[PDB]
């Protein structure tokens, strides 16, 4: 047998020998992150990760990936959030994200914490994942802005949220996308991402090269002509507007 690779639009992939029905089912299946090097390798059923052990893709020979397992016992499984459960392992970090970003005090005035790059990367680089509980637009839109600091629209049916107390990294650090602050001149964008542990979510992707220890920012993209937005954003929107005559 040969081997099949199935890529998502985001650059991640599933790879392995498929079974008789072309399904990613077996004991030597892997999800490979968009760096084409960090991998979760092990038991999958029809492409769902049952037990993925942290591995590094070392080479590919005739299309077949050759992995080395990382030391430790870092194991992961498909664990999609619900409306009330953000994660079965809130303190288990994503191994790809952990190498790319860290949380620290923001450089933006009075903005609390922010998300920073650990290393220099090029444009179009996935940096961080925005997982959270999955609730409805009705609930979010019909409640006060003070509850809506971390809400992210996923699609026409679902909003992802990281509600208190999970907005503190001491309580939740499985993903960190909710820590990226807003800018009207951002260095990153949100993009759809299909994650083997979190399921369909969004990620933070650079739109240009970024330096080590640079703060990562995204345009929150609130509706300016409904501005349906929190106060700090309205205050900052007028400034942005001033800057370009």
């Amino acid at each position: 047998h040969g081997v099949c690779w199935i890529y998502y639009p985001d650059g991640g992939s599933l790879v392995g020998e498929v079974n008789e029905d072309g399904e990613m089912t077996g004991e030597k299946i892997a999800y490979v992150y968009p760096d084409e090097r960090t991998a979760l390798y092990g038991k999958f059923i029809d492409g769902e990760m049952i037990e993925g052990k942290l591995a590094t893709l070392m080479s590919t020979e005739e299309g077949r990936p050759h992995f080395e397992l990382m030391p430790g016992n870092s194991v992961y499984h498909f664990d999609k959030s619900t409306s009330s459960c953000i994660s079965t392992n809130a303190l288990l970090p994503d191994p790809y994200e952990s190498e790319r970003v860290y949380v620290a005090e923001s450089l933006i005035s009075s903005a609390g914490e922010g998300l920073f790059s650990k290393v220099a990367v090029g444009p179009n680089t996935v940096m961080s994942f925005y997982n959270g509980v999955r609730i409805t637009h009705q609930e979010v839109d019909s409640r006060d802005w003070a509850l809506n600091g971390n809400t992210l629209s996923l699609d026409e049916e679902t909003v992802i949220d990281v509600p208190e107390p999970y907005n503190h990294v001491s309580k939740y650090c499985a993903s960190l996308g909710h820590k990226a602050n807003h800018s009207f001149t951002p260095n990153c964008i949100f993009d759809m991402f299909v994650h083997p542990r979190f399921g369909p979510i969004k990620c933070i992707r650079t739109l240009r090269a970024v330096e080590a220890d640079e703060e990562l920012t995204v345009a929150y993209g609130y509706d300016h002509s409904p501005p349906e937005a929190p106060e700090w954003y309205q205050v900052e929107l007028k400034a942005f507007q001033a800057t370009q005559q």
């Binding site: 637009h137 979010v140 839109d141 409640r143 802005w145 809506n148 809400t151 992210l152 629209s153 909003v159 949100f190 969004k202 995204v218 929150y220 993209g221 609130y222 509706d223 349906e228």
Partner: peptide, 8 residues
């Protein structure tokens, strides 16, 4: 929409 990144 009181959430980040909604498509209008």
């Amino acid at each position: 929409s009181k959430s980040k990144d909604r498509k209008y």
